Amino acid sequence: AGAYVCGEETSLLNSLEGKRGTVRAKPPLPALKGLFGKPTVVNNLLSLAAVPWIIAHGAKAYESFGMDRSRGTIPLQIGGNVKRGGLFETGFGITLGELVEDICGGTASGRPVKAVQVGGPLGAYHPVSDYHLPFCYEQFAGQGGLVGHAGLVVHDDTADMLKLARFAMEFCAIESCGTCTPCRIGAVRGVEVIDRIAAGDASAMPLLDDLCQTMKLGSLCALGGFTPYPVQSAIRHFPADFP
Amino acid sequence: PPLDWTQDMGTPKREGAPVHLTIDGVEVTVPAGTSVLRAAAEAGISIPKLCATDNVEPVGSCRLCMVEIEGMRGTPTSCTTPVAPGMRVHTQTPQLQKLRRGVMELYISDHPLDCLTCAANGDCELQDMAGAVGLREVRYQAKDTHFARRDATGPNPRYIPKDNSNPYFSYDPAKCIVCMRCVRACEEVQGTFALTVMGRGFDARISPAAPDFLSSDCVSCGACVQACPTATLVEKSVERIGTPERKVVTTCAYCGVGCSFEAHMLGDQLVRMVPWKGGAANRGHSCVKGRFAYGYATHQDRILKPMIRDKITDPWREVNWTEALDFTATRLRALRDSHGADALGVITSSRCTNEETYLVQKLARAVFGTNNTDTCARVCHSPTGYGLKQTFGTSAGTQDFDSVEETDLALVIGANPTDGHPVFASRLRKRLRAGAKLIVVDPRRIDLLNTPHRGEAWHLQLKPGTNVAVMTAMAHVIVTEQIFDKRFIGDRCDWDEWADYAEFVANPEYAPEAVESLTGVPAGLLRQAARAYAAAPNAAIYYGLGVTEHSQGSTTVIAIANLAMMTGNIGRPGVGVNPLRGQNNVQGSCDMGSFPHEFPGYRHVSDDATRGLFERTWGVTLSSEPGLRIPNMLDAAVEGRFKALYVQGEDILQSDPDTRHVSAGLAAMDLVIVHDLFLNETANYAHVFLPGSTFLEKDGTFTNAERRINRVRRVMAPKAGFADWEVTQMLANALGAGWHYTHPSEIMAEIAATTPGFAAVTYEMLDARGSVQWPCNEKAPEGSPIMHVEGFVRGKGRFIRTAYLPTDEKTGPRFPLLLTTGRILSQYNVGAQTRRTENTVWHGEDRLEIHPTDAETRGIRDGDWVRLASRAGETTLRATVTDRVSPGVVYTTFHHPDTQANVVTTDTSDWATNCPEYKVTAVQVAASNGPSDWQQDYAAQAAAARRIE
Amino acid sequence: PPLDWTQDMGTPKREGAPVHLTIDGVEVTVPAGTSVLRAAAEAGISIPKLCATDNVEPVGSCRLCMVEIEGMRGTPTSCTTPVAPGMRVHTQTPQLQKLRRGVMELYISDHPLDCLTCAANGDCELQDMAGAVGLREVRYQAKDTHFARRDATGPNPRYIPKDNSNPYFSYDPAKCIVCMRCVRACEEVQGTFALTVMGRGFDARISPAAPDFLSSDCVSCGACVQACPTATLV
Amino acid sequence: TDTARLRAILAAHRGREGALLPILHDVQAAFGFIPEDAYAPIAADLGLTRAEVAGVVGFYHDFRKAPAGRHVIKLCRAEACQAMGMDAVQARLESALGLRLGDSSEAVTLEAVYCLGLCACAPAAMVDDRLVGRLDAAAVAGIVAELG
Ligand SMILES: Nc1nc2c(c(=O)[nH]1)N[C@H]1C(S)=C(S)[C@@H](COP(=O)(O)OP(=O)(O)OC[C@H]3O[C@@H](n4cnc5c(=O)[nH]c(N)nc54)[C@H](O)[C@@H]3O)O[C@H]1N2
Ligand SMILES: Nc1nc2c(c(=O)[nH]1)N[C@H]1C(S)=C(S)[C@@H](COP(=O)(O)OP(=O)(O)OC[C@H]3O[C@@H](n4cnc5c(=O)[nH]c(N)nc54)[C@H](O)[C@@H]3O)O[C@H]1N2
Ligand code: SF4
Ligand code: SF4
Ligand code: SF4
Ligand code: SF4
Ligand code: SF4
Ligand code: SF4
Ligand code: SF4
Ligand code: SF4
Ligand code: FES
Ligand code: FES
Ligand code: FES
Ligand SMILES: [Mo+6]
Ligand SMILES: [S]
């Protein structure tokens, strides 16, 4: 019914139940107690699309693809400013350098790329310098980032990182159940702090850092616990755009 | 004493095995389910919390109770973190200090700095948790705020104007911290889902689906106002007056549930009343009346000086105590010497304490020299004490109200707990929402049936009067089938009588298929309900005035007890036959005499072994004959041989049947004393008047429905200067008795020494333990939460052959419809206490719940004036067409005296206790403009008789 | 145990004969010298007070402990009113409610609303005595204030910057309610007269005769910091 | 013929598990919004309270509180579609119709959707159940041409 926060397992099964999609706390897991208090297995489509293949074609085959920890094939969705967009299904270990400079050419505009955002708006902004970073959960989660549903957009040099860092919080604000404070108020205050940063204030950046940290460590779900990542990444990777 | 009382612990208390954990260097042992926060609380180590309360289940909104745990990544919340063995937690690390500071910063960035000019200063949980963490600066220059009336460039669209619609509390959202302790409480505790969170995110605002609280589905219980930390939802008495300093534990003067309150006091001025989180009757919950309606004590209409008349036609005379008592005693002695001691009588009040009741029954027995005493019990729940006496041996309840927590089925005959006993209905719904099943045998759709998130439910919408036919059919169903417990019967009950009972009930004439014609309930539904009741492991019967107040009340109660005995739903938590007592201390009044056939302790008056003890203790010769009952009193007075009467805390005119006859009998009475707070309907025929005392100025006890003895404390000072027991002893000594009581402790000691059960009762006990069930002797010192746990009281239950007899109040051509009389949540029985409050909003006029199809033919429309042409009188009332009632049935209310409803009521009554037939009366509802010939005369009399000089 | 420990009584305890008096319907027996306020405290009936402490002798500054006494004209102060035999006093009449409201109004008209972000939140005697009396509005649109850093047309001449010279306590006069429980304590209890009231009237400000506390004749005993209700000395 | 439609809808979704959301979808699809005159019957037939039925309607964005215009124009505002110039399309289009983002009217209703799946086709829009991609500054001409 038009809510990005209903993708969370708890909020999802809360929306299924006929109520409003407010994220629940997690003393009980949905597995133990979920839909109508009864155990429920809640999974993504890509995970429930490989199950048949896995059980039929042999699990030992599906384990062949991937790195040491991550095993299997993943689709990489490539959109935004990019010549050859679409979908690339392949095994982990591939560098986004190859995926973004060789496979899918460059940009549609013909300009270079300044940003490559893995994951949705809950994902860091990986620049050209990170082209030597292969696609796997552990290494990306280690190198200050996130790889989820393999989302991958592209931005060229004519993009403003300030606008995007602001959009991040604007999103976290418009998309928010309102259960816990660090997203209720945190986001709509960060959206102001970013404007202040745009103005030129110096008492905003450390303020922003503290806000982001409390958001990370306090927010109930990841919509307000990973929202800081876009911001901090755009700030530490592209400082030539943030006065 | 327990900490759950003084201290607000974080989360609800759980049942489980002992788990040991270390909270910030302090060893702790708590059940497994118990959270980290509650354990830390129990350990003395307090962790900051704003959105977590004991009343409701924890939610991760505040993020202020974060704690660093070894083995867990990040800073998890204690409220939503269940304890584990050997867990070492760190409450206050530097990082956590910083994070909590940040969160409070984000709060206060959207909060007005109206501290120091706000209602909840010193009683706000945001202010102390903002000072606790140590917030020293807010760095967020906020442009988007909810409180700012005027934003840049103009009005703030977020700003929502205050709501003062409800006369008892106000909703200022400008200060709302969305935590939803209002929503959670209204939904989990009260059970009426009238509050929600409209919006998504920062735009989220608490709101009822209506313009104002009053127009919504809010019953005014104040559980949101009690659980709101930040003055958003606030009592108006705290706005007008300052925040209170001290607290005193008292109880409600209503409903017989005995909700234990703490009055918050600022000097002597009662600021507010808030539940105590004590008493198994209410675990921190209440309703409109007890919570808010306490302003009758501070009303201008209250009478504060004695008044003597010498003739009803003559005006009053404000007078001191001495000569008032002198005149009273003189007239009394005259009438006594002339017509005898049996020409007197008293009418005790349940509304009063049990000490005062004891003094009054003494005054009637020792002093006057008669057994002519009585009480409200005689029009309500007197048949109960006959039935449960004939069957079990105790004229009282069988279980507490915590038992319902363990029930698995609830069978409700003739009750409406959503109005009558709201705090019981709350804990009922708490279970109904948790799977338990429900059967409702009322002829009128009750709001308990339409509760939200309800499980299964059956509704036997029968015809008023046929209440024993249905029970008999249930029994026939259970006996023709074989579902009953034979082990239970063979162990706790008798078999030889059971065989006869079964051979009788097994007749195919008392079957559900034959009663459908006279009863009106379907057969299949009835069979299903019976099977469901019999099959369930722990079922429980709750009954009220739909069984007792009829031509056959004791019979119905006996049938119900037969059911409960047969099925095996006795002697265990979750099962029992509970009558829902009404007024406070009805149980205590009945226990302390208040009956013309017994002494304190349900001991008959003809008992020589008892009369001896009492003559020995009082040093006076008593009578062995049972006394008259109110109907008998009035019939006599009409016939003569009855001249005096001392009405204590009762309205014998408005709150009794056949207003005409009772008035005629109250008039032919040389002396009728009145001892109420206000000038009443009964005081229109009075010759004397003695002021009284409220429960705030009193000191003593109340014995509620579950046999619980709650303690009543003095918070104010008597405005008349004397409490009710003081006035009673005044009168008694003025007549010649010679009592000397300076405190009700001596009185309770007397009671203990005289009757058993209260033998171990002492105010110290009541203070320490808090509450006691009156069956408390040297055996069972702590109390008896459950009765008949080990064999019945008489020794063996008794199965009685109940049968359905056609009522004499059948309907005919000129009286086709039927009638019923009931209640509302806002107003109390006669509303002498409640009409003098702001509860005239929800109910300011009594109305007639007629059926639509029974309205079209007559020409009635909602809001029209109609007349109730009955046999025993006539009245006029404002109509209300509703599909709530069945066709050929009507429902009135008696809260307001402007409409004389009990003039329609007939003299027909029960056979044993003569409890009137309030719930059946053949009427005729027609359309009319002129109110009446009776109401006019009543108004005239009341006007010409309530004049003071 | 004694109440002098848990509860801050109004005035110092006096030696004398037993005197019986009725405080708001409560019988009380206290030495002759003992004041109305201390007796009311001993009786459980609390009367609002801000400038009276047990450590020092009472002064009629706050005017918040006013009580209506039979036989006395007007509303006299309990702190400066010695008990008399048979005296019947009324702690809370309507008129007194109104007057106390007015006085707290006049206070808060010159006080910053830094509650909720101040050091003495929950331990301030101005806040609880402002909530106790039941202040709900301030009708004085003040232009002359001590706390406002910037006034109309520029800097406030009354504003005195904070003093953090002493490593143990700080003096923020912006929140001072002149009551002089600091002066009184430093002079009567400690005995080193290092604090005074510089100025006459509204311009009156607590001060030591020196730029900062450290340079003065202050030995750091914290008897001013203990007796300061309103977080000025904290 | 409102009560009739509503009763039919509720009968169609009788006995389901968590049937509030579907019922509300169907209601919105029928009329165009969730009328306040249909908060009560739903609650009754489902055993809920007006409050919850209102909260559910409030939380979710797809449930209109008032009707839209004859036409509707949703326009992504997410990262990808932003990348390839959604702002320009937005400006052009809102100048064409004269209605800013979120600003509705009786003619049209311009709003955000934040994704349509057309991420590769970065500039993406939803005009009256018709998806459109690669919305250059020329396609807007046809967008408005078929959209009076
Ligand atoms: N049509 C119809 N009539 C009925 C009934 C029905 O169901 N339908 N129910 C019957 C039953 S259930 C009963 S309980 C009665 C109840 O109704 P009543 O027996 O009339 O008792 P109350 O409503 O308390 O008011 C009676 C008077 O006592 C005064 N009083 C209250 N508290 C005190 C106190 O602490 N001290 C003193 N000295 N006086 C006090 C009240 O202010 C009031 O003036 O009504 C009976 N009449
Ligand atoms: N707010 C509030 N609380 C109260 C009171 C009040 O007036 N206001 N009254 C107090 C008093 S003293 C009383 S006694 C108690 C008890 O109060 P309850 O036990 O709740 O009794 P009532 O509400 O009078 O009505 C009982 C229900 O059964 C229905 N009924 C009618 N005839 C029959 C019949 O023949 N068979 C069956 N099975 N049902 C029938 C009635 O219509 C009604 O709905 O509550 C106390 N609490
Ligand atoms: S971070 Fe935002 S969306 Fe997530 S649970 Fe908290 S309030 Fe809801
Ligand atoms: S609710 Fe509490 S924090 Fe808010 S203004 Fe009132 S007293 Fe201050
Ligand atoms: S007063 Fe009671 S019923 Fe009304 S909103 Fe508050 S909690 Fe709910
Ligand atoms: S009204 Fe009170 S309890 Fe409800 S969300 Fe707001 S602050 Fe919390
Ligand atoms: S009327 Fe009954 S439920 Fe209400 S507060 Fe009094 S005792 Fe409790
Ligand atoms: S001193 Fe007291 S009243 Fe003044 S700002 Fe601090 S806490 Fe508030
Ligand atoms: S700390 Fe200094 S100024 Fe304060 S009372 Fe002690 S000596 Fe006086
Ligand atoms: S510094 Fe403190 S004690 Fe001294 S006058 Fe000011 S408020 Fe009173
Ligand atoms: S403090 Fe436990 S979550 Fe609010
Ligand atoms: S209160 Fe006694 S004078 Fe300050
Ligand atoms: S992001 Fe707009 S198309 Fe998916
Ligand atoms: Mo009753
Ligand atoms: S009663």
* CA distances for A91 relative to A46, A52, A105, A221, angstroms: 14, 18, 20, 29
Q: Classify strands D73-75 and D110-111 as parallel, antiparallel or unpaired.
A: parallel
Q: And the tokens for B669?
A: 């009475």
Answer for the pair A143, A133: CB distance below 8 angstroms, yes or no. Answer: yes
| Shortest distance, CA B627 to any CA of chain D (angstroms) | 53
* CA distances for A118 relative to A124, A137, A141, A144, C214, angstroms: 7, 11, 11, 12, 59
Q: Which residue among B192, B197, B452 places its CB closest to the CB of D48? A: B452
User: Is the Cβ atom of D119 under 6 angstroms away from ligand 13?
Assistant: yes
Quick one: A121 and A195 in the same domain? no
Measured between beta carbons, which residues in chain B are less than 8 angstroms from residue D47? 452-454
> How far is C71 from C80, CA to CA, in rounded Å?
16
Ligand number with the minimum distance to the CA of B347: 1
Q: And the tokens for B599?
A: 């002494």
Best A5, A6, A11, A15 residue to mutate vs chain D (most D CBs within 10 Å): A15
> How far is B198 from D54, CA to CA, in rounded Å?
7
How far is the centre of ligand 1, averaged over its atoms, from the C-alpha of D85 (Å)? Answer: 77
Phi/psi of residue B143, nearest 5 degrees: -105, -30
B352's CB contacts (< 8 A; 6+ apart) are B585, B589, B648, B649, B698, B724
D91's CB contacts (< 8 A; 6+ apart) are none
Whether residues B198 and D50 touch (CB distance < 8 A) is answered with: no
Going along B363-474, which residue ranges are E strands? 409-413, 437-440, 457-459
B101's CB contacts (< 8 A; 6+ apart) are B133, B134, B135
A166's CB contacts (< 8 A; 6+ apart) are A191, A194, A195, A198
3-state secondary structure of B389: helix
Q: And the tokens for B506?
A: 């097994």
Going along B765-922, which residue ranges are E strands? 772-773, 821-822, 847-850, 865-868, 876-881, 892-893
Q: 3-state SS string over chain A?
A: CCCHHHHCHHHHHHHHCCCCCCCCCCCCCCCCCCHHHCCCCCCCCCCCCCHHHHHHCCHHHHCCCECCCCECEEEEEECCCCCCCEEEEEECCCEHHHHHHHHCCCCCCCCCEEEEEECCCCCCEECHHHHHCECCHHHHHHCCCCCCCCEEEEEECCCCHHHHHHHHHHHHHHCCCCCCHHHHHHHHHHHHHHHHHHHCCCCCHHHHHHHHHHHHHHCCCCCCCCCHHHHHHHHHHCCCCCC
Q: Method used for this model?
A: cryo-EM
Q: Classify strands C150-151 and B598-599 as parallel, antiparallel or unpaired.
A: unpaired
Taking the alpha carbons of A85, A87, A90, A92 in that order, is the dihedral positive or negative? Answer: positive
3-state secondary structure of D72: coil
Whether residues B140 and A183 touch (CB distance < 8 A) is answered with: no
Chain B CA closest to residue A173: B201
* CA distances for B931 relative to B681, B840, B866, angstroms: 19, 21, 8
User: Is the Cβ atom of C64 under 6 angstroms away from ligand 9?
Assistant: no
Please compute, for residue B74, the number of CA atoms within 13 A of its CA located in the half-sphere on the CB side. Answer: 14
> How far is B571 from B491, CA to CA, in rounded Å?
12
* CA distances for B29 relative to B32, B38, B77, angstroms: 9, 11, 19
* CA distances for B569 relative to A132, B487, B492, B534, B788, angstroms: 75, 12, 12, 9, 11
| H helix intervals, C9-93 | 36-43
Quick one: A89 and A144 in the same domain? yes
Looking at the DSSP assignment, which residues form a beta bridge with residue C27?
A: C22
> How far is A103 from B106, CA to CA, in rounded Å?
46
Answer for the pair B915, B813: CB distance below 8 angstroms, yes or no. Answer: no
> How far is B117 from C104, CA to CA, in rounded Å?
10
Answer for the pair A71, A79: CB distance below 8 angstroms, yes or no. Answer: no
Please name the residue whose Cα sits nearest to atom 7 of ligand 8: C121
Q: Classify strands B18-23 and A113-118 as parallel, antiparallel or unpaired.
A: unpaired
How far is the centre of ligand 11, averaged over its atoms, from the C-alpha of D117 (Å)? Answer: 38
3-state secondary structure of C77: strand
End-to-end Cα distance, chain D: 30
- For residues B912, B916, B918, B919, the Cα torsion angle rounded to the nearest 10 degrees is 20
Q: What letter represents residue B346's amino acid?
A: V
Residue found under tokens 């039929």: A56
Answer for the pair B92, B45: CB distance below 8 angstroms, yes or no. Answer: no
C144-154 core/surface letters (b: 16 or more CB in 10 A; e: else): ebbbbeeeeee
Q: Looking at the CA of residue B227, tell me the nearest atom of ligand 6.
A: 3
| DSSP classification of residue B923 | B
Q: What letter represents residue A187's amino acid?
A: A
Whether residues C114 and B111 touch (CB distance < 8 A) is answered with: no
Whether residues B121 and C128 touch (CB distance < 8 A) is answered with: yes
Taking alpha carbons only, the member of B543, B540, B542, B532 closest to residue B568 is: B540
| Shortest distance, CA C201 to any CA of chain B (angstroms) | 24
Q: And the tokens for B325?
A: 């008592």
| DSSP classification of residue D38 | G
Q: Classify strands A73-78 and A86-91 as parallel, antiparallel or unpaired.
A: antiparallel
Chain B CA closest to residue C98: B241
Angle at A125 between CA A119 and CA A127, to 5 degrees: 125
List chains adjacent to chain A, taking adjacency as at least 3 C-beta pairs closer than 8 Å.
B, D
H/E stretch holding D59 reads helix D50-59
Q: 3-state SS string over B434-454?
A: CCCEEEECCCCCCCCCCCCCC
Whether residues B196 and D47 touch (CB distance < 8 A) is answered with: no
Ramachandran assignment for A79, one of left (phi > 0), alpha (psi -120 to 50 degrees), beta (any other): beta
Quick one: A98 and A169 in the same domain? no
| DSSP classification of residue B274 | E
Ligand 11: residue of B35, B62, B179 to mutate (most ligand atoms within 8 A of CB) is: B62
End-to-end Cα distance, chain C: 30
* CA distances for B698 relative to B355, B638, B714, B740, C150, angstroms: 11, 36, 5, 18, 58
- Percentages (nearest 5) of helix, strand, coil residues in chain C: 25, 15, 60
Residue found under tokens 């049947």: B657
> How far is A62 from C111, CA to CA, in rounded Å?
72
Ligand 1: residue of B304, B548, B594, B833 to mutate (most ligand atoms within 8 A of CB) is: B833
Taking alpha carbons only, the member of B675, B57, B641, B685 closest to residue B324 is: B675
- Between chain B and chain C, the number of residue pairs with CB atoms below 8 A apart is 83
How far is the centre of ligand 15, averaged over its atoms, from the C-alpha of B351 (Å)? Answer: 9
Answer for the pair B899, B875: CB distance below 8 angstroms, yes or no. Answer: yes
3-state secondary structure of C171: strand
Quick one: A145 and A172 in the same domain? no
Chain D CA closest to residue B451: D47
Answer for the pair C193, C187: CB distance below 8 angstroms, yes or no. Answer: yes
Taking alpha carbons only, the member of A12, A153, A22 closest to residue A77 is: A153
> How far is D13 from D30, CA to CA, in rounded Å?
14
Measured between beta carbons, which residues in chain B are less than 8 angstroms from residue C121? 127-128, 130-131
Q: And the tokens for B853?
A: 């199809």
> How far is B742 from C101, CA to CA, in rounded Å?
40
Taking alpha carbons only, the member of B25, B42, B10 closest to residue B90 is: B25
Residues in chain C: 234
Phi/psi of residue B850, nearest 5 degrees: -90, 160
| DSSP classification of residue B886 | P
Residue found under tokens 């706790």: B492
Answer for the pair B489, B495: CB distance below 8 angstroms, yes or no. Answer: yes
Residues in chain B: 949
| Shortest distance, CA D54 to any CA of chain A (angstroms) | 10
Please compute, for residue B828, the number of CA atoms within 13 A of its CA located in the half-sphere on the CB side. Answer: 25
> How far is B852 from A137, CA to CA, in rounded Å?
69
| Shortest distance, CA B116 to any CA of chain D (angstroms) | 34
Q: And the tokens for B81?
A: 């973190």
Taking alpha carbons only, the member of C160, B89, D35, B469 closest to residue D9 is: D35
Q: What letter represents residue B730's amino acid?
A: M
Whether residues A18 and D19 touch (CB distance < 8 A) is answered with: yes
CB atoms within 10 A of CB C22: 15
User: Is the Cβ atom of B177 under 6 angstroms away from ligand 11?
Assistant: no
Looking at the DSSP assignment, which residues form a beta bridge with residue C30?
A: C19
Phi/psi of residue B453, nearest 5 degrees: 55, 40
Q: Classify strands B892-893 and B821-822 as parallel, antiparallel or unpaired.
A: parallel
- Percentages (nearest 5) of helix, strand, coil residues in chain D: 45, 10, 45
By CB atoms closer than 10 A (0-12, 13-18, 19+), residue C189 is middle
Q: Hey, where are the domains in chain C? A: 1-234
Phi/psi of residue C223, nearest 5 degrees: -100, -25
Taking the alpha carbons of A190, A191, A194, A196 in that order, is the dihedral positive or negative? Answer: negative
| DSSP classification of residue B457 | E
B776's CB contacts (< 8 A; 6+ apart) are B757, B758, B759, B760, B761, B782, B783, B784
Please compute, for residue B812, the number of CA atoms within 13 A of its CA located in the half-sphere on the CB side. Answer: 6
Q: Classify strands B307-308 and B876-881 as parallel, antiparallel or unpaired.
A: unpaired
DSSP codes of every residue in B142-175: -SS-SS-SEETTEE-SS----B--SSSEEE-GGG
3-state secondary structure of D100: coil
From edge to edge, which strands make up the β-sheet containing B269-275?
A: B246-251, B260-266, B269-275
Answer for the pair B823, B893: CB distance below 8 angstroms, yes or no. Answer: yes
Whether residues A80 and D119 touch (CB distance < 8 A) is answered with: yes
Q: What letter represents residue A50's amino acid?
A: A
Resolution, in Å, please? 3.3
Chain A CA closest to residue D80: A80
Answer for the pair B307, B688: CB distance below 8 angstroms, yes or no. Answer: yes
Taking alpha carbons only, the member of D82, B653, B274, B208 closest to residue A79 is: D82
Residue found under tokens 């066709």: B887
Measured between beta carbons, which residues in chain A are less than 8 angstroms from residue D55? 20
Residue found under tokens 């309507």: C94
Q: And the tokens for B514?
A: 């034959």
Taking alpha carbons only, the member of B104, B761, B796 closest to residue B488 is: B796
User: Is the Cβ atom of C225 under 6 angstroms away from ligand 10?
Assistant: no
DSSP codes of every residue in B480-498: HTT-S-HHHHHHHS-SHHH
Taking the alpha carbons of D120, D121, D127, D131 in that order, is the dihedral positive or negative? Answer: negative
| DSSP classification of residue B731 | H
Residues in chain A: 243
| H helix intervals, B310-353 | 321-339
End-to-end Cα distance, chain B: 54
> How far is B199 from B182, CA to CA, in rounded Å?
16
Q: Classify strands B772-773 and B865-868 as parallel, antiparallel or unpaired.
A: unpaired
Q: Looking at the CA of residue B171, tell me the nearest atom of ligand 6.
A: 1
> How far is B916 from B658, CA to CA, in rounded Å?
10
Answer for the pair B772, B708: CB distance below 8 angstroms, yes or no. Answer: yes
Q: Classify strands B539-543 and B409-413 as parallel, antiparallel or unpaired.
A: parallel
Taking the alpha carbons of B926, B929, B933, B937 in that order, is the dihedral positive or negative? Answer: positive
> How far is C131 from B122, CA to CA, in rounded Å?
7
Answer for the pair B585, B350: CB distance below 8 angstroms, yes or no. Answer: yes
- Between chain A and chain D, the number of residue pairs with CB atoms below 8 A apart is 87
Question: Does D39 reach chain B within 8 Å, measured CB to CB?
Answer: yes
Angle at C144 between CA C141 and CA C145, to 5 degrees: 95
List chains adjacent to chain C, taking adjacency as at least 3 C-beta pairs closer than 8 Å.
B
> How far is B346 from B365, CA to CA, in rounded Å?
10
Q: Does an interface of 3+ CB pairs under 8 Å exist between A and D? A: yes
Structural domain boundaries enclosing A167? 161-237
Q: And the tokens for B620?
A: 């006076």
Angle at D114 between CA D112 and CA D115, to 5 degrees: 125
Domain with residue A201: its CATH number is: 1.20.1440.230
Give residues (CB < 6 A) around ligand 15: B 350, 376-377, 380-381, 582-583, 586
> How far is B114 from C72, CA to CA, in rounded Å?
38
How far is C-alpha B205 from the geometric centre of its chain's CA atoms?
A: 34
Answer for the pair B227, B187: CB distance below 8 angstroms, yes or no. Answer: no
